[PDB]
């Protein structure tokens, strides 16, 4: 395990082995490598172009140092333009029919982060591992706040912050779900990452994970047009192109799906749960639809959309019980107040 | 002057402007940029592939901040350095023959690769490698030779030391030394580690204001004139850049077995050198002469390399004495003597 060997290897643009990558990651995460080297390695790593094995190596290193809870039977809706936080809203409909272990963080792009939205609704986003398991059984849903679960990460913080650029770590979050959930919907920000991250995921041991990229470029199912997804399972990777019409609806005006703050997102969500905002509701449903498909609850996406319609109608109540059993219900009520 | 802008620019593989490069260098050298960023910039710089302008920018930033002495009439034999074969320090031995016929301002440094640095060899022979600027000028007049220890005339460099050391890889700085001679040397024989840089650095040098500088790359891959085969050189002057291929035979000798030119320590290099000055090691001596030959050519003392080789033969015969006077006027002569005893005699 010689950093300098590795660094030179990377500069020479030579991909690493899953093992090389994993050891290097462990070291970096454990804070055993000097800031100057981490900086250099990440930069080289990016300029060379991270490869599947390296993604896998790092992913494995990550999982190994995180605080874990066991709920592999759970599903997660993994993760810009500033759209309302669908994944989260969507995690709520899902909790009605299956345990949900939502991995998430605040945002670095103006309040919109799933942790912020939840915090806005009154949810107490800091859930200790012990009570986490409890909540999942008691309500079928729990939020795993990333900062609280990847404490080892602090050792790379300074470098990441100082560099202020995209490193390999930026695409690891969604592949490092604390609860080890086997069922998951994962959004990526670029088609390239679709292929890359899918192949990477194929080796991270998943029952079923669906990666998706939607026009005009979002880490979610496209509300306006084509959505490109990679279905990864124990037996391979399947490509699947899709159009928002295939759900049986007409394209949603992107203008309506955008938010400007955590509370603004919350309101748009709750309004959708009330039937006061069809656009947002449809956005939440085409996404939940794909997730339902990942759970094998439906056979086609149209079926999935339909099912989701039934779910959304019971979602505000579900949300209420979730927040009430871990958070401030009133903050939720004030948000309900026509908002 | 925003580092982060630059960094991103580099990551996106976009070459900088001589000015951009120069300001960035000044900042880094002045130690105004955090270690994490210097590390990132150098790495990006290398993975993108440094360009002429960047080389120039950094070179200018360096000079501007170096401690200087004035001896442009001097010549220097610098090597871009490399991951070569731990070869004997020819440039240095060769600087000695040159002092016989022209002032020599040898730029040089220690080394992390064993102990094969020109500063180490000189230190081994008894030379006092730390020469203050004032006495430096003196020594050059008194003996026609002086060694400018990089760490000492480029004190600003300390600010990038930690990063360079920690990284432990080739950065843009590794190819700046020879282009930043503290004496402003107008004549220079500069050896590049790859046929590539050869062109890059030549074009770069064309704008650094030189009377005549000859860059060279020799098989099987050394920052010196090839003792085994073809040597590729770029002759840069006020009126252009000339390409010149050459073979070790064009000197009138048969290829030297690389095995004989390799060393394992500063003292080992010294001995091999002194032995060559005694006539006890032809292989090393021939290595020293084909190089000195090219340098002589850069000085316009000869018209062809064969002539240069011949002239060098005459020079080497008076070199041990010259070396003696150099060390004796700035160093420990005895250490030199013990080395003379160790190299038979
Ligand atoms: Mg999301
Ligand atoms: Mg050299």
UniProtKB/Swiss-Prot annotation, chain A:
InterPro entries: Anthranilate_Pribosyl_Tfrase, Glycosyl_Trfase_fam3, Glycosyl_Trfase_fam3_N_dom, Glycosyl_Trfase_fam3_N_dom_sf, Nuc_phospho_transferase. 5-phospho-alpha-D-ribose 1-diphosphate binds at residues 77-79, 83, 85-88, 102-110, 114. One of its GO terms (biological process) is L-tryptophan biosynthetic process. Pfam families: Glycos_trans_3N (PF02885), Glycos_transf_3 (PF00591). Homodimer. HAMAP family: TrpD. It comes from Saccharolobus solfataricus (strain ATCC 35092 / DSM 1617 / JCM 11322 / P2). GO terms for cellular component: cytosol. Its EC number is 2.4.2.18. It comes from the Archaea. Changing residue 174 to A: 300-fold decrease of the affinity for anthranilate, whereas catalytic efficiency remains nearly unchanged. Its cofactor is Mg(2+). Anthranilate 2 binds at residue 160. This is Anthranilate phosphoribosyltransferase. Mg(2+) 1 binds at residues 87, 220. The keyword Acetylation does not apply. The lineage of its organism: Archaea, Thermoproteota, Thermoprotei, Sulfolobales, Sulfolobaceae. Catalyzes the transfer of the phosphoribosyl group of 5-phosphorylribose-1-pyrophosphate (PRPP) to anthranilate to yield N-(5'-phosphoribosyl)-anthranilate (PRA). Pathway: Amino-acid biosynthesis; L-tryptophan biosynthesis; L-tryptophan from chorismate: step 2/5. Anthranilate 1 binds at residues 79, 105. Keywords: Amino-acid biosynthesis, Aromatic amino acid biosynthesis, Glycosyltransferase, Magnesium, Metal-binding, Transferase, Tryptophan biosynthesis. Mg(2+) 2 binds at residues 219-220. The gene is trpD. Binds 2 magnesium ions per monomer. Belongs to the anthranilate phosphoribosyltransferase family. GO terms for molecular function: anthranilate phosphoribosyltransferase activity; magnesium ion binding. It catalyses: N-(5-phospho-beta-D-ribosyl)anthranilate + diphosphate = 5-phospho-alpha-D-ribose 1-diphosphate + anthranilate.
């Amino acid at each position: 395990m010689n950093i300098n060997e590795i660094l030179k290897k990377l500069i020479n643009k030579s991909d690493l082995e899953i093992n090389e990558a994993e050891e290097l990651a462990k070291a970096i995460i454990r804070g055993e490598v000097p800031e100057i080297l981490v900086s250099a390695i990440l930069v080289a790593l990016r300029m060379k172009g991270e490869s599947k094995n390296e993604i896998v190596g790092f992913a494995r290193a990550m999982r190994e140092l995180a605080i874990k809870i066991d709920v592999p039977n759970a599903i997660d809706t993994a993760g810009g333009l500033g759209t309302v936080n669908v994944s989260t809203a969507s995690a709520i409909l899902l909790s009605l029919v299956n345990p949900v272990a939502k991995h998430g963080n605040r945002a670095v792009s103006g309040k919109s982060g799933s942790a912020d939205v939840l915090e806005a609704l009154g949810y107490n986003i800091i859930v200790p591992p012990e009570r986490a398991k409890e909540l999942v059984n008691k309500t079928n849903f729990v939020f795993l706040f990333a900062q609280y679960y990847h404490p080892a990460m602090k050792n790379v913080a300074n470098v990441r912050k100082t560099l202020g650029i995209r490193t390999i770590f930026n695409i690891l979050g969604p592949l490092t779900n604390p609860a080890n959930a086997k069922y998951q919907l994962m959004g990526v920000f670029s088609k390239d990452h679709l292929d890359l991250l899918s192949k990477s995921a194929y080796e991270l041991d998943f029952n079923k994970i669906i990666l998706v990229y939607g026009e005009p470029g979002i880490d979610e199912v496209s509300p306006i047009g084509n959505t490109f997804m990679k279905i990864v399972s124990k037996r391979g990777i399947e490509e699947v192109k899709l159009n928002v019409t295939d759900f049986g609806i007409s394209p949603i005006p992107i203008e309506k799906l955008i938010v400007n703050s955590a509370e603004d997102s919350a309101i748009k969500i709750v309004r959708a749960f009330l039937g006061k905002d069809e656009h947002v509701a449809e956005f939440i449903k085409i996404n939940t639809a794909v997730a339902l498909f990942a759970l094998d609850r439906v056979g086609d996406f149209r079926e999935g959309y339909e099912y989701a319609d039934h779910l959304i109608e019971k979602s505000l109540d579900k949300l209420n019980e979730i927040i009430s059993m871990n958070g401030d219900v009133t903050k939720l009520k004030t948000i309900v107040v026509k908002s």
